[PDB]
């Protein structure tokens, strides 16, 4: 059979200032009091208070829960669920990067299906649709405000538990590039290379569609041109807005086409060592592309053109090669770490990271199907 499906929230706001609608949009759902899920950093910057003011003007109450953590944890879910129940909230607003979107998605699911966030690992292992949720995005790399994914760390197993589930698609998303201006360069760089990774893995996924293809291609072309600008000058407003679009394009593509062994492996490093997700993808992306080359050489040749390379006079193989050269050059230019050893990864952990990566759902749509020793080789190469 050849069926496929496309999912995203039914209303999706973009552009400078769109965050000011969160109040009146929340009232429109007839919710009374929302739990505002965010993280400590943005709470300290005061972003949680600016948004909470907007929501309360519209007559909707806020309880602020700034305890979601980079690489959100099952404990954050349990703790925020308690604060959801304790403060009599009927909705969730998320405010931040993908960590706040996924914390809030877990809380909103479990507040309507009951057990623990581990009940629902895998694919549509759920029952009811999650409680009303508006996702306000502030990094330019995840797309989690658009996706049916929620990535939650299992703290006793050391593994980022991918939860794929139609019930966690947000009600409404908001993508306001004015809230992204204050990303430091290194956060700009890594979330941006997470978007690029989404776009490239979605383009080469076995679950790719002409719709997801259309989005992924646009995302790669934009990122290629505007991500190094946004990193060099976070106050370049044009680059911020373009990255906000690219982020959403890549999120819509991967949500519906699937990822690959870049995310499969990056999820394990993130669980063992709590690395930044986006840095893990940037480090890994060239090695997985290299391994995948022979299964998708024409698509990698086209990525090489998307990334601005000149492929005139070359074989398809040689043009695919230039896509990897260009990814490497972009990583070096954005000051991405050279490998995982210098960050703290452990030689003795490589086989368990490999084995766990082959269990990740993101591995299912990788165009090349590896054996365990090949996955190990990819992690070894990324140690450099």
Ligand X SMILES: NC(=O)c1ccc[n+]([C@@H]2O[C@H](COP(=O)([O-])OP(=O)(O)OC[C@H]3O[C@@H](n4cnc5c(N)ncnc54)[C@H](O)[C@@H]3O)[C@@H](O)[C@H]2O)c1
User: Which residues bind to a second copy, rule: CB under 8 A?
Assistant: 1-18, 166, 169, 206, 209-211, 213-215, 217-218, 222, 228-229, 231-236, 241-242, 245-246, 248-249, 252, 292-295, 297, 308-310, 312-318, 329, 333-334, 367-369
Can you tell me which residue has the tokens 């940037």?
A: 282
Residue 277: CB minimum distance to Mn ion, A: 6
- For 62-77, b/e burial (b = at least 16 CB within 10 A) is bbbbbbbebbbbbebb
Using the rule CB under 6 A, which residue among 7, 17, 30, 41 binds ligand X?
Answer: 41
Residues in a beta bridge with 173: 12, 135
Residue 142 interacting with ligand X (CB under 6 A): yes
- As a whole number of angstroms, the distance between CA 111 and CA 88 comes to 11
165 makes contact with ligand X (CB under 6 A) = no
When asked if residue 145 is in the footprint of Mn ion (CB under 5 A), the reply is no
Q: Which residue, among 229, 224, 239, 204, has the nearest Cα to 330 in the 3D structure?
A: 224
Contact region for Mn ion (CB under 5 A) — 102-110, 191-199, 215-223, 337-345?
Answer: 191-199
Strand partners for 91: 34
Rounded-to-integer distance, Cα 98 and Cα 357, Å: 21
The least CB distance from residue 372 to ligand X, in Å, is 20
Tell me the three state secondary structure of residue 346: coil
Our CB check for a second copy shows the closer of 288 and 345 to be: 288
Residue 14 touches which of a second copy, ligand X, Mn ion, none (CB < 5 to 8 A by kind)? a second copy
d(CA 362, CA 370): 13
Q: Which tokens go with 295?
A: 């299964």
Distance separating alpha carbons of residues 287 and 262, to the nearest angstrom:
9
Q: Which does 86 bind (CB under 5 to 8 A by kind): ligand X, Mn ion, a second copy, none?
A: none
| Partner from ligand X, Mn ion, a second copy, none contacting 149, C-beta within 5 to 8 A by type | ligand X
Nearer to a second copy, 15 or 339 (CB): 15
Rounded to a whole number of angstroms, the minimum distance from the CB of residue 99 to ligand X is 3
Going by C-alpha positions, the residue among 194, 176, 192, 195 that lies closest to residue 184 is 192
Residue 151 found at the interface with ligand X (CB under 6 A): yes
Q: Is 182 in the site for ligand X (CB under 6 A)?
A: yes
Q: Closest Cα to residue 150, out of 202, 199, 195, 98?
A: 98
- Give the one entry of ligand X, a second copy, Mn ion, none that residue 156 binds, where binding means its C-beta sits below a cut-off of 5 to 8 angstroms depending on kind: none
Kindly tell me which residue out of 23, 80, 97, 260 binds ligand X, with binding defined by CB under 6 A. Answer: 97
Tell which residue, 197, 209, 158, has the closest CA to residue 279: 197
Residue 277 in contact with ligand X, rule: CB under 6 A: yes
Q: Cα 183 to chain center, whole Å?
A: 16
**DSSP readout, 33-52?**
EEEEEEEHHHHHTTHHHHHH
Rounded to 5 degrees, what angle do the CA atoms 226, 136, 139 make? 35
* 365 contributes a contact to ligand X by CB under 6 A: no
Backbone angles phi, psi at 34, to 5 degrees: -100, 140
Residue 6 to residue 21: CA distance in whole angstroms: 26
User: Which residues, 21 to 80, sit near Mn ion by CB under 5 A?
Assistant: none
Min dist. Cβ of residue 3 to Mn ion (A): 25
Measured from the CB atom, is 102 or 309 closer to a second copy? 309
C-beta of 266: minimal distance to ligand X in Å?
A: 8
CA distance 347 to 355: 14
Contact pick of 194, 201, 302, 321 for Mn ion (by CB under 5 A): 194
Sites of contact with Mn ion (CB under 5 A): 194
Sites of contact with ligand X (CB under 6 A): 39, 41-42, 70-72, 96-100, 102, 138-139, 141-144, 147, 149-151, 160, 179-180, 182-183, 187, 191, 194, 277-278
């Amino acid at each position: 059979n050849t069926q496929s499906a496309f999912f995203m929230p039914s209303v999706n706001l973009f552009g400078a200032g769109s965050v000011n609608e969160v109040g009146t949009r929340l009232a429109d759902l007839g919710v009374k009091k929302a739990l505002l899920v965010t993280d400590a950093g943005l709470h300290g910057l005061g972003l949680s208070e600016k948004i909470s003011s907007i929501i309360r003007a519209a007559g909707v109450e806020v309880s602020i829960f700034p305890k979601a953590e980079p690489n959100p944890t099952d404990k954050n879910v349990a703790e925020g669920l308690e604060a959801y129940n304790a403060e009599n909230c009927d909705s969730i607003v998320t405010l931040g990067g993908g960590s706040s979107h996924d914390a809030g998605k877990a809380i909103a699911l479990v507040a309507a299906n009951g057990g623990k966030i581990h009940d629902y690992e895998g694919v549509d292992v759920s029952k009811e649709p999650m409680v009303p949720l508006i996702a306000i995005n502030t990094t330019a790399g995840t797309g989690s405000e658009l996706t049916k994914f929620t990535i939650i760390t299992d703290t006793e197993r050391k593994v980022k538990m991918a939860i794929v589930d139609k019930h966690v698609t947000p009600t409404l998303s908001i993508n306001d590039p004015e809230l992204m201006v204050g990303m430091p360069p290194s956060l700009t760089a890594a979330t941006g290379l997470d978007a690029l990774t989404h776009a490239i893995e979605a383009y080469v996924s076995t679950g790719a569609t002409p719709i997801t293809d259309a989005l992924a291609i646009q995302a790669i072309k934009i990122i290629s041109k505007y991500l190094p600008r946004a990193v060099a000058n976070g106050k370049d407003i044009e680059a911020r807005e373009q990255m906000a679009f690219a982020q959403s394009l890549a999120g819509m593509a991967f949500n519906n086409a699937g990822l690959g062994y870049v995310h499969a492996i990056a999820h394990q490093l993130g669980g063992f060592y709590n690395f930044p997700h986006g840095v893990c993808n940037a480090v890994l992306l060239p090695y997985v592309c290299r391994f995948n080359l022979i299964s998708k050489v024409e698509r990698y040749a086209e990525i090489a053109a998307f990334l601005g390379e000149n492929v005139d006079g070359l074989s398809t193989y040689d043009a695919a090669e230039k896509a990897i050269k260009a990814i490497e050059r972009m990583a070096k230019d954005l000051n991405i770490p050279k490998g995982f050893k210098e960050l703290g990864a452990k030689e003795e952990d490589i086989e368990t990271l490999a084995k766990n990566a082959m269990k990740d759902a993101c591995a299912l749509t990788n165009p090349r199907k590896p054996k365990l020793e090949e996955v190990i080789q990819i992690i070894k190469n990324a140690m450099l």
